Design a protein around this ligand. Sequence first.
Ligand code: HEM
Ligand code: HEM
Ligand code: HEM
Ligand code: HEM
Ligand SMILES: [Cl-]
Ligand SMILES: [Cl-]
Ligand SMILES: [Cl-]
Ligand SMILES: [Cl-]
Ligand SMILES: [Cl-]
Ligand SMILES: [Cl-]
Lengths: 310, 308, 309, 308, 310, 309
Amino acid sequence: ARLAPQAVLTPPSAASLFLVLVAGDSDDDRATVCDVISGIDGPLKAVGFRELAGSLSCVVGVGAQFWDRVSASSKPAHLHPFVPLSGPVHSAPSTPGDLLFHIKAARKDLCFELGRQIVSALGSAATVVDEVHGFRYFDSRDLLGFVDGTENPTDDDAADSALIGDEDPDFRGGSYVIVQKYLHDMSAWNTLSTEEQERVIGRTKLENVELDDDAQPSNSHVTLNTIVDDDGVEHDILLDNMAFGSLGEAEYGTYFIGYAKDPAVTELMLRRMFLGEPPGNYDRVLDFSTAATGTLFFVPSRDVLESLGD
Amino acid sequence: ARLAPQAVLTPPSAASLFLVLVAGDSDDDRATVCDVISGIDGPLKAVGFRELAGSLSCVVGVGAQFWDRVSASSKPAHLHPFVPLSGPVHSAPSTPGDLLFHIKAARKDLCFELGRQIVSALGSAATVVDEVHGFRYFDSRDLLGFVDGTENPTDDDAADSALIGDEDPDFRGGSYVIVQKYLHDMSAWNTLSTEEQERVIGRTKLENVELDDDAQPSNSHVTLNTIVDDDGVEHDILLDNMAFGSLGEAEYGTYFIGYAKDPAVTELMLRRMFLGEPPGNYDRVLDFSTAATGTLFFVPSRDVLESL
Amino acid sequence: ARLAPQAVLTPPSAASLFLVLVAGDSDDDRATVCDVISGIDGPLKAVGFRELAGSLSCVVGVGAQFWDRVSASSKPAHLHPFVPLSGPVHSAPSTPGDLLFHIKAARKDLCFELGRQIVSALGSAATVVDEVHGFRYFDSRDLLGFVDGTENPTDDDAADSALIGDEDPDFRGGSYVIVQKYLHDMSAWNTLSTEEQERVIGRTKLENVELDDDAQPSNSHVTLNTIVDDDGVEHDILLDNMAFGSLGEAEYGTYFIGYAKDPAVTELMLRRMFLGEPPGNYDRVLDFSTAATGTLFFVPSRDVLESLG
Amino acid sequence: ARLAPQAVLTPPSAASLFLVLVAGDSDDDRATVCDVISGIDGPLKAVGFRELAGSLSCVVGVGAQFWDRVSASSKPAHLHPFVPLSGPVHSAPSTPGDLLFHIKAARKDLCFELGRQIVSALGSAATVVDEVHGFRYFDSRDLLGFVDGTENPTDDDAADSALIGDEDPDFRGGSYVIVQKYLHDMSAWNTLSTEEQERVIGRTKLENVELDDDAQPSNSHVTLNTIVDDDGVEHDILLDNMAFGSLGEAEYGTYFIGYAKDPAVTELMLRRMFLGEPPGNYDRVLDFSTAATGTLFFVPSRDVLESL
Amino acid sequence: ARLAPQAVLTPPSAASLFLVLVAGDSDDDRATVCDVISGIDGPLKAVGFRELAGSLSCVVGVGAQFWDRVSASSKPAHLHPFVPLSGPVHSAPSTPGDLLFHIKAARKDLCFELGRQIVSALGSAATVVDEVHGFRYFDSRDLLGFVDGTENPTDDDAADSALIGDEDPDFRGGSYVIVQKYLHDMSAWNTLSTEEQERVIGRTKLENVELDDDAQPSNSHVTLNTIVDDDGVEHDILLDNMAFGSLGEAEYGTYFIGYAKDPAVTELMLRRMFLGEPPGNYDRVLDFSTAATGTLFFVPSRDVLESLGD
Amino acid sequence: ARLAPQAVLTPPSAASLFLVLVAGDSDDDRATVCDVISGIDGPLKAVGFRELAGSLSCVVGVGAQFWDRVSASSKPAHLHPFVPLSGPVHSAPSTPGDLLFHIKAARKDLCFELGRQIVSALGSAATVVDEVHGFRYFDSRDLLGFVDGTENPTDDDAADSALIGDEDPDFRGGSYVIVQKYLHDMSAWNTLSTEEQERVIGRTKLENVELDDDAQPSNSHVTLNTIVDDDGVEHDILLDNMAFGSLGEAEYGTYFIGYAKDPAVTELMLRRMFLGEPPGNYDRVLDFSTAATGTLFFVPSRDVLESLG
Ligand code: HEM
Ligand code: HEM
Ligand code: HEM
Ligand code: HEM
Ligand SMILES: [Cl-]
Ligand SMILES: [Cl-]
Ligand SMILES: [Cl-]
Ligand SMILES: [Cl-]
Ligand SMILES: [Cl-]
Ligand SMILES: [Cl-]
């Protein structure tokens, strides 16, 4: 899918930009926002076409509160604000955001330029509340040092997991995306042995091999994020996480971004992580990662995006 | 689409070759030409397989006259010669061409070698009437200094814009292509300010952002080439333009090549450019660009191409 | 088309690994084999994800006999062990193989690592009988010096040639693959003149242009491997051949690997090559190439593969 | 120069990291800092070897004050703190910095990982006071839209311009570097015409051709930064400038970083920019660019660095 | 040597531009020419710096007649016009040229742009008389289908062969370059068998292996271009030949460009090719290649180039 | 630094070929060997020129014994056959080799082709005794999973460490190279914990950071291979190690290849490794790595090489 908005299914990239903005109160602000996002293919090609490879992509997401301001009588079945979670020691807050731009490219400058053109076009109609510059870290590792993104669905399976189909045909081809900006405690993580780290995650560190059943803790990240229903059907999500950080402020981070045809799946994964299964048996990754943001957005198909609102 | 003839929807390339040929009078010349173009996947794979990336593509176009020589029993709905335009200031000539080979690859040698093999195979049966060696110029620019090709439809919109469908099912998967070789008057172009040039085109020069509606002149290139039907639906074409030139002859050029499921879209862009909308309000880009060729070809699907 | 097993239609790669294995007679062994191959997308992603480009692929093949050990019924319409051939001068041996792993990537390391993880996971349950490290040789050439793989089908023509369709619907999207590890007689080939070699293959050497119909020997590799049915319709296979070799053992090989929706096409090609058409008029490529292995496998669709057992 | 510390003459890179640090008061802080920087080839190889291409480089700079703390017995001839400038309209502040790490690589992760390892190794002994993540912007442009770095000396001229030689043989192979973090007023810049901007810079915008002598304003950036001695010999510096910014904070920046065997060349460029030549005739580029930092460091040769 | 004029020793490139121009009669034309070529590092960096790799190079050459117009009292020891040669069937003409720009890059656009800027700067002061767009053809082959450039000297040996040293220290670091634009007769070449072609050249076609002594004809291209003196010292030149052509005009070509510290070596090679050794035993490549141009230029070191004239 | 033989100082490559040969006792054989190796720049350019990047290199090594057959006097100051070692637990065998071809390139095909042309040109005059196909493994790692080659000297430090200088002026620009083909015990290595492996090597595994002085075992590979003379001056070698292996034979190797201007440094490292410092305190890398070959060669400068015989 070359230079087309809402290409949710793009392969991993060397660089990414995650921009979360809050729309202004007024009807003017609301219309400018609609004009920019509905014509997003403009900037996308304006920038992307300058690179022969055409690696630039941009996925627009819209929050529940803003959606109801521009499309009151027509709504995707599962659009609602991020559901906050409160475990005994770790919490997943719900933080503001009306707009997500999830930008990917083979180069930083491409992501920066598109972001620059998008922010410029929005002007005073919206305010950036979160901005993260993602980058590939060695052989697809996260800053905890583990290969990150492995078990992502691909092919037909990626389409099945991520994109709305017959269940909500008015919004077929859309998706739901949840973001959380995680910051790690590197000191504490480094006090663990590699083997203990492998138990937290559920895979070997260097070689990235899944631990067998008999050595795989019931609270391992992989175990808790494996969703099987009563029918025995596996439910998967599509992740585009990227490393980010700042040496001077001592921030080493993982940006979580997960797409699903039904946010119920992602929410369940989160419930199992923060609250545990069985209860209290929570994901130990959370001892070393703290979510600073939590926002859900609806990702409209192109046809629906181009219609807003107008 | 890997090494398949008539791959109309290929992305941009670093290099291209546009070859226009006129076929000979004789029944033998006609048969050779048909033998060569119907088996075009041979040379295509013979060279293209030699590159790991497999970037090589070749689209064959056939002119109206030549088609009538080989298939008088059925005709694509819109196949006719290129229509000349005579405007208030500028004109678009209709020039000869029975065959088009639109060749694209990541490297010159691939384009050149495919062209070599095609011309050798055709021998005395056809003559090259136009030959242009296209090349990418920095970040997708044309020699006027502007990013060129930006608003090309992509993906589904691209197939919808370019590929023949239910409206003419006998030639489903085919397309129509129009070529014009433009030469630029560079010194004249350079006497304009950047702002003047931006108003001629419709976009900012370095940053390639569309001018807002209220700074967009009604005769801007972008404005005249925006085709909107009465139900408000835009109609787009697929452009594969490349820079070319010769320093010794002071040629600095843009090869125009546009594909559409219905050439009337492209033709209307041309009329609106050359004659103006409203009439008189012609495309200033034509004050700095002169077409030395103008030819329309039908682009058969693989199936149809293979049966010729 | 990224990091999904049974991706038959992948484009040529710079590196290859061809692993052929026989399985243990044990029941523990059968089960292990099934766990490994049914969950093959695990290792494939474990390795492949580490490369940004995602060039790594792995096609799993299962031999006729081992297939019967894990699928009583059902069975694919044309699954059977490799038919050996005994021709006037040259012979195609049918050699053992229960499992094929056809691995391709842009790098050696990715191939080797994936293979290492597959071999480790199988442990004692299976044994390697043939291991070939394939590599791209200059501009897609084999060690005989000719461009190799040129006339391969592409796009929809490739899918139609290689993938089981409406005609065997329980196994739709599967394929049949035949391998033969050919070793070459270099010095004998070198005594031919370029023009003689061109007669043998059916195409010009440097330029890879197909010889004229009137200059085309009736026993040229190309003509022998051209299949046209009675209605005039051509039938093609998908080749993924790679060069391999060893300098000290003086081994110089082409690894043949061909996929079809029906091995009837491949087997006919092999007959025309080894027996000849007319009989005795065999493929001269065989005078300089000797097959050291010969094994047929069924390539299950992704769904079929994941369901064992 | 492959993975050697103090490789001053490296070509441009897709990515960079500029880290400025102030060292702590204590004798222990001083020893840790010295241990880290004297063994800098460890982290450098520890990360850099992991990339086949070996694009990773790291240059260490030491400020005047910190140097006096570690080597009071000998001093490079021109080491002093950065001199503040107060001009008619604009000023260049002198801001703190004991250590500079100028890191370049083909990839962000390499720069980041080296920076991570250096900061971890330094621990409580030093504090990061400035951190900028530089990136190439299209075809070597800065965020003002101009090709930036064009007239850098190369090869022998580069070593002659940047490396200390016979004039100070105790520190042969060393250099002097000045950094300034510039932030741009983009909306103001955009109210100029392209022609106006070209006159501010001294070169045409898209094509990066020097303006002829008679269209060159006497206060153009290029004009003011051309240093010619009384025998007519030009004196050049080596620039490694990179774009940077933050969309949320509306920061759009150019990190200035310039190397010279004698910082007085660079300093004179700065005075001619900030105060003007003649006085009052200051660099208009400063009407759109504001320096938030200004720091001078000495760049020791490997030998000297390793002995600290 | 990054983005520096007169880098004679550059490695092979995917693209090249050879421009040969004739300077105008007048003192004005003469000064403009001097101003452009002496400041050539300007355009070179103006263009080259826009490509991260920095693959662009430009070597300026100056003909004998023009040299004497701008530097009458100071002259490289061996600067003279191209010496024409007349064999019984094949001839090497001497054709005009005051200026050579030999431009190389990884991309066409870079070579084109620099050429464009050079021609623009020269204006009416000079006229292009030859222009060739060179391109790599597969694995460094020429259009005759043979690997071309193999036996080029590299390292110290390239410097020793190509660049003026102590023998003429006023011009140390300069070189002498000869160009000939050859057009091939592909029909005639294709009537030969591969083996006969291998005998013409002196190397195997596909594998590019030198034929052994006992199967190597005394008139093979390789034999005739092997220069050994009485002392037994081999003398080599540095070649940067490139394919070029035009399908419509049926031109398939090899552009010869050879650099040497003393053009005597190149001239001897040419004498042996066109006249034979022994006499009449000429280079059979010439049955299939016809020189349309022949011009010698002096290539000044940077310091000398920057001094002209002024 | 392009397509010139005896380019010792080349950077790491994606592919390697290590060819070790013994020469015939014949005089015809001696002469052929000399013609091939003295004119090695021929094949090197014949192959290397076909790649735009020019990544192909070839270093020719000549064993002590064969050297004596073609150079009566002169002789390099420190040329001698590989000194074998017999340590408390582990042993370094000294194995045959007259010729070493150390070939590196960005592609396999370039390596293989060059090697094929060298073997063909030598014909009966020599025989391959060891052939290793080296490859880059992920981010410059060996099969033990550690970054391998990190502390290699660079720039002038590399030239000074590896190239013969003023001290043996007839052979200035030459080098001495030692090879050992190590095979690993993977499953034994895998029973160690990451932290134990880190103790064995001397560096962190993922991040490749050198362990603190106070956490550094006195028998860690790093400490054992650190050479500091009596005046305090460090002495380094240049390593070009590559991974190799075979899945079916269960071979997982590191090919050691180290260049020094004086093999005294390399041999001391080898002693500290095999014998230990103090004695018995040997390199634990040796508990999981066994050398199957061991051979020293002189690397002549380009001038010296071209002058045989
Ligand atoms: C004659 C030389 C020409 C030059 C130098 C030129 C240049 C440009 C440029 C710079 C753009 C803006 C970037 C883009 O979206 O592609 C553009 C757009 C476009 N041009 Fe041209 N053009 C030329 C001829 C033509 C012709 C003959 C046609 C139609 C037959 C044409 C049709 C279009 C269309 C359809 C667009 C996109 C408009 C939109 O939907 O925004 N151009 N051209
Ligand atoms: C000794 C091992 C072999 C070598 C060296 C070899 C070589 C070649 C070459 C050089 C070509 C021409 C380029 C191309 O179109 O791919 C070719 C074509 C072909 N070969 Fe092979 N081949 C070998 C074995 C086989 C076998 C065993 C089969 C069938 C089982 C086979 C089937 C084909 C087919 C179907 C084509 C395409 C023919 C066409 O339609 O033009 N090859 N082979
Ligand atoms: C403040 C932000 C700056 C911007 C946006 C900027 C931009 C530019 C540009 C576009 C050029 C022309 C291309 C080139 O040759 O590099 C240039 C040239 C140059 N600049 Fe800057 N510059 C800045 C600051 C500085 C400073 C502070 C200095 C000196 C301390 C400086 C020294 C130079 C020099 C020496 C040249 C080359 C002049 C010549 O010899 O032709 N620049 N700059
Ligand atoms: C079993 C085969 C070997 C393996 C797997 C191995 C592995 C390693 C590793 C992982 C490193 C650390 C990264 C680096 O700096 O390169 C290293 C360093 C080193 N190794 Fe080896 N090595 C092997 C054999 C040898 C041998 C036989 C020698 C000497 C003859 C040797 C000498 C060195 C040296 C000199 C260093 C750099 C030490 C330093 O100064 O920090 N290695 N090796
Ligand atoms: Cl960004
Ligand atoms: Cl071409
Ligand atoms: Cl492998
Ligand atoms: Cl960074
Ligand atoms: Cl050009
Ligand atoms: Cl090899």
